[PDB]
């Protein structure tokens, strides 16, 4: 409907109606739910909610099905005075019912189209089950794998994170201006504004502190890129940002988000984060938390009651302008309008059961493709991999038969529909002998059974891994290791004198040095999702050729954290010309290098890259154009990730030794050759100075072209002269 | 001499003389050195230094003896045109020849007078060997025991560090206006400005980042306190501060240090730090490093040549004002004048050999007293300790006989003057059997020998520890554990049936859970210094009663780092009520609490504290006066450390759960009772706000009185009304 009618609605609502529009509730607090109706009464009472509240609530959080949605919406519109439909929001993080790989695995794909397709299928299915908004992409930069939520990020690089972030937004939303017509797309919500991934000591919800310059330089850019590509909502972070909880941080949300980034959509709290500013000790009570959060421009309170119970009194007493509430209500209403909810409140479902669009075989193939794009081949000594189809496999360990391969933040996907490792392998390999072990134990009886199975077979597939519940939200591990029983199992298996492949399933970087030394090959599958065992079978047999690269550094040990590729030089860098010396930046007990670096991954093919002659000089404001020829010099069809890095050698701020500024994944048949070009615009040469200006300074830059952050050729370009 | 004559001198110097005055060199680059003369000609060449340079250099670093000094000063004054004497500077960190405990141990004393005495004795001896300046106190706040330089800090609390920092300046300098008269006192140099202790991942020289507010709130206060108490010099830090190397950070050094803090003394670079701005990538070359470091107000270049080779040309070319040079030279000259070098360049030594004053028996008793004040008794189950003097001791471990007990940053003390644990013990206990083992091994032969000795005796003194070389500068450990062989050794000894005391020697917090659990008692000696063996024997026999408290948290494990008492609450604090719940700030694998907390330590006595009745309310600006009656309710004389903490319950910045604001160590005979009174000024109630103002806000505070950060009574005060 036309904008004047939306504004008219704000004009016609009562103050109590306006307040309640700023509240989000679980489905079972609404009349007409068709699930968990036993939780409805006790919880209404603890929250002190009444019908006057629920019958005017703005939004639903986490409906269970299309019928829950229809029931709740139909009943709500029977009783709602002005006919304002509810908006339905959910966590579709790496898939709906067809579960794709966890986001950290998707980072390892270095492939933008993989990420868009995952988001498109996610929306196809989520809208088919009645959802209007997804709380995705999660764009928190991560340098600390203790933190369980690393699995929701694309990793340690702001540029990769920005690019894949835009790809998710595009896949979820398509053309943002036609969400009222394209009802298989949905609104995306960028989360968590801001810098939540820097949680101190990897502890959930813990303190974050960094300088404003670093916040601009590294932590904000991906939120910004997704916002600029049209993301419809943003969600606040649980953490403090320079001492003030993000949720009531007026500088952050008013000046930066709404001012500098020009975000004019719904800002929704993280769960309870409005109330939690009290725990943080920056509001005395719910009246203060209400007041400050609305001043900061939080439009929608997720599952707490500060707004419903306190805004009236604040507005009446004059502590808070009613104008701030009207503008919140206007953003809520515009979102609903943008989704077409005033013409069709059932968003395509009322006369059209789209059950047929859920968990299709086409979708399952897309998920499998994504899994084979995302896996990272870490070791492969002796061309152990790929295995011949008639290889006799002893499949052993906790991930041999475990159905827990769908990953964390899988709110709607079902283990029964997933493919485990044994099942996947038996579709490909005629001879498999299996010994399941538990995640945290290694008994004598296990060792006897493993030993018998390995004696019978030719090669061991050792399937190790985390339970998903050891990561995700509030899954912080102080020591980023697997249970010790699993390292003991790898130690045991090695003694049996057969070639060993370790297939590792997990949601964070781990300490894998002992796994690498104990095996001939090591394949990092992360959690691939619904098609996990096929992903595994195809990569091990060579039907698919591994092509993923690490999007997060794998530490030598927990105590090396944080370690990351885009680090500062220091005043005393370790060099090959001084290694051995005492008075340089090093540790007495480990290398400075991570065990495996950013951008690293192996292949069954072999590539050779050649970069075209580059200029020696460049004007300010000018783009560098980088042309690269890649050839597959082996007999095996394969994909490689060409990566381009920049360094600013001398600047007014000590700048990182490398930053990624371009990537493309190139597919090549045996012997095929291709040329690709990259434009590094002058923004690729720019940075935030100590004054917080985005600047370009004349001087020397190095340009690194290669297939990891370590396997690069290097070139020099002197930037100077005039601008443009 | 008079100020006019100092100024006159600046006038009379040539440019080349002014430039060289800003250079500091090792003694063997000067004519007249009586040690390492073979190093002179080659290094003069590598540094491209001439006579015109060395004959006008401003300062000497690390002279080796009184005779090195005299010889160098005689020869230098022979050729120096205007007669400007050299100033001699040295690292007297925790003792000269009489070595005291390491600073982190002196932190655990909680005893201002212990710290002043150490510094007084340090100056007495250092001046006797011809030194004018010491590079102490080191006031870097530390939260990361991976960093080897934690040993040089007094720990994790800015208030303790501030207070103890003032005590050290007072002991070194006494009356700062009378350094030309008091020739047994010496100039103090505060180091390292600023925030060096926040090195990321505990890696030496590494990146430091934090918000400016945090910098003001926690990282700056100790440097400021020492500067306000009259410290004569300041030394720059190796790290970046907000992306700019401290050494050339003009905001840091001109605006904060000289401006806000009103420091008008010599600013000396850390070693090589002027040149190392090149490595950091904030200067292209030595000409830029020179200009930038001089713009920042660095007066004295430690052992690099940027100034010496580049200032002339920068000044002649108009890219640097000569007025900045003249400012630096005048500060150098004024420091010399403050030390009385213009009337007596040998600072009391020339006709007065003070050899007699070095390593006296009186000085040794003061170092032993500092040792018994500084040790911390961590465990003592079933009153194993004190031991009766007729107790039969099996003394075993790497620290049984090791002479390595003087600590890191012991530049002048000698192990041959030190008392080892065996020697110490044998002066007290008639029956000791000794089985030394190596630091990093445990052989079958060791175990047989250990088994025989423990069978013969009644109690085990298990002496465990670090080599001092595993810490100090560029001694970063990624995992804060002793070698595994030591933990094995503790496990083995526990099986032998006999009671075990572990005496631990070290320079950092370590993972000690496994030691606590394998022994009946645990005494943290750190590195007591020269008298270490007598320190250990007196505490174990109870001739001295343990009275130290932890000044730095002992983590549960490496991955808990950083953990510290003055932490923020977060939005989801783990409470006694919600423990076990998934969605709160916690780890899956360890407790939140460190293994031992700030302010914790045991005693052979038992104490009772009670706090006199406090006001419910306070005006803004008003001091809170806290009165505490402590009784010793045991038969054993001892000392308790009374600690007072404040918390700001609600604020415009999320504030820490506690901050230490007062402390006093009280000595009490059996049965004795005392009253101590504390004034918490309105400054104790103040903090830095998001706009970087020092403010006091109205509202609730909690006041905690007790004997650790955990063992406290709590009281509430509402601050409001008008301002005093
Ligand atoms: O230099 C950092 C480091 O200082 C060491 O001091 C040296 C000193 O520099 C040298 O001139 C003298 O001969 O010996 C000492 C070694 O005893 C100190 O020993 C280290 O602990 C500290 O980390
Ligand atoms: O479940 C809805 C939301 O709850 C928040 O608190 C979580 O941290 C988000 O990641 C999630 O999108
Ligand atoms: O109350 C804790 C709630 O917090 C949210 O952050 C979680 O994502 C929900 O699982 C949970 O119910
Ligand atoms: O509650 C927050 C959590 O959402 C759950 O429903 C998911 O299964 C978890 O993996 C995630 O960490
Ligand atoms: O690296 C050269 C010098 O650096 C200083 O910081 C160290 O303390 C010296 O021990 C060392 O010789
Ligand atoms: Mg540059
Ligand atoms: Mg307050």
Author numbering:
A (entry chain A), B (entry chain B): 1 to 724
From the publication, what sentences describe this entry?
In the gene cluster containing the lin1839 gene, the lin1840 gene encodes a putative glycoside hydrolase family (GH) 3 β-glucosidase (BGL) (GenBank accession number: CAC97071.1). The structure showed that Lin1840r forms a dimer of identical subunits each composed of three domains. The active center of Lin1840r is located at the interface of domains 1 and 2 as in the cases of known GH3 BGLs.
In the Cel2 and Gen2 complex structures, electron densities of Glc moieties were also both observed at subsite +1. These Glc moieties were thought to be the non-reducing ends of Cel2 and Gen2 due to the orientation of the hydroxy group participating in the glycosidic linkage, suggesting that Cel2 or Gen2 binds to the enzyme non-productively. In the both complexes, Glc molecules were observed only in molecule A. This might be due to impurity in quite high concentrations of soaked substrates. In the Cel2 complex, Trp409 stacks on another Glc moiety unlike in the cases of the Sop3 and Gen2 complexes. Unlike Lam2, Arg572 effectively excludes Cel2 as a substrate. However, the distance between Arg572 and the 6-OH of the glucoside in thioCel2 is so close as to cause steric hindrance. Actually, Cel2 binds to Lin1840r in the non-productive form. Moreover, the structure of the Lin1840r-Cel2 complex was compared with that of the JMB19063-Cel5 complex, which contains Glc in subsite −1 and Cel2 outside subsite −1. This complex is the same as the Cel2 complex of Lin1840r in that subsites +1 and −1 are filled with separate molecules.
